[PDB]
Design a protein around this ligand. Structure first.
Ligand code: XQE
Ligand code: ZN
Ligand code: ZN
Length: 232
């Protein structure tokens, strides 16, 4: 009833939306992985009379539920989606999107990693993002490759109209006491990648992590802190 959604409000298979700013929502869903339940976030950005989706809802049935929730709450068609790295919380559901007519995109690095891991593969390759510090425009957002962090391919997304920074899984929530699932991470490079984000988007007003509660710019420094404590 207005607070940011959590698993206790989200059974696995359900999706809730949260208004972040004018024309910007996050989506929240829950999924089980290795016998534990996790929330995860994505983004929705209004693109005139269409919508741009950032990340799936972590699974085929969750992503179908996401589309139904968007139709209920917003009522504009999702025409394009970008996945911000290769893990199932970002690409699991791309097949559902593609069968619902959504054009799916990711960097070539994400597409190769997804293919090698056996995860769903976005259709279209996003060039111009292969070097750290690169940025490209994609509808109403900017896509930015900060360097390796949570994964080698992770992208962040900025909504300039609203100064919303969607950090994806390279950014953790303030309450986090650990650095999440780091199996594919570069813990040594991650702080440098976070510093690049901080330098590029100093006017960000909302910062959204890949999992957990949005906050402000403090999430970036907190992420560097929890990652450093993990490495050590
Ligand atoms: C699907 C993804 C995955 C699944 C389950 C959990 C997560 C987490 C995670 C975990 C804990 C917290 C709370 S916290 C910050 O307080 O710690 C959190 F916020 C996010 C993240 C992430 O951090 O983004 N992502 C996860 N995922 C990752 C991998 C890597 N590979 C493996 O795990 C191998 N065993 C192969 O299976 N594969 N899928
Ligand atoms: Zn991940
Ligand atoms: Zn994640």
């Amino acid at each position: 009833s207005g607070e940011y959604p959590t698993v206790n409000e989200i059974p696995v298979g359900e999706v809730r939306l949260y208004q972040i700013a004018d024309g910007v929502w996050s989506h929240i869903a829950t999924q089980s992985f290795d016998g534990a339940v996790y929330p995860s976030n994505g983004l929705i950005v209004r693109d005139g009379d269409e919508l741009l989706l950032i990340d799936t809802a972590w699974g085929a049935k969750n992503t179908a539920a996401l589309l139904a929730e968007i139709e209920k709450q917003i009522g504009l068609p999702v025409t394009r989606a970008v996945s911000t790295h290769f893990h199932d919380d970002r690409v699991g559901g791309v097949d559902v999107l593609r069968a619902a007519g959504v054009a799916t995109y990711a960097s070539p690095s994400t597409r190769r990693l997804a293919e090698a891991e056996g995860n769903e593969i976005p259709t279209h390759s996003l060039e111009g993002l292969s070097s750290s510090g690169d940025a490209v425009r994609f509808g109403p957002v900017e896509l930015f490759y900060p360097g390796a962090a949570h994964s080698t391919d992770n992208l962040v997304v900025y909504v300039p109209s609203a100064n919303v920074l969607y950090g994806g899984c390279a950014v953790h929530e303030l309450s986090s006491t650990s650095a999440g699932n780091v199996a594919d991470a570069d813990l040594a490079e991650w702080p440098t990648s976070v510093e690049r984000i901080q330098k590029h988007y100093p006017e960000a007003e909302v910062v959204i992590p890949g999992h957990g509660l949005p906050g402000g710019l403090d999430l970036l420094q907190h992420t560097a802190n929890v990652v450093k404590a993990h490495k050590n």
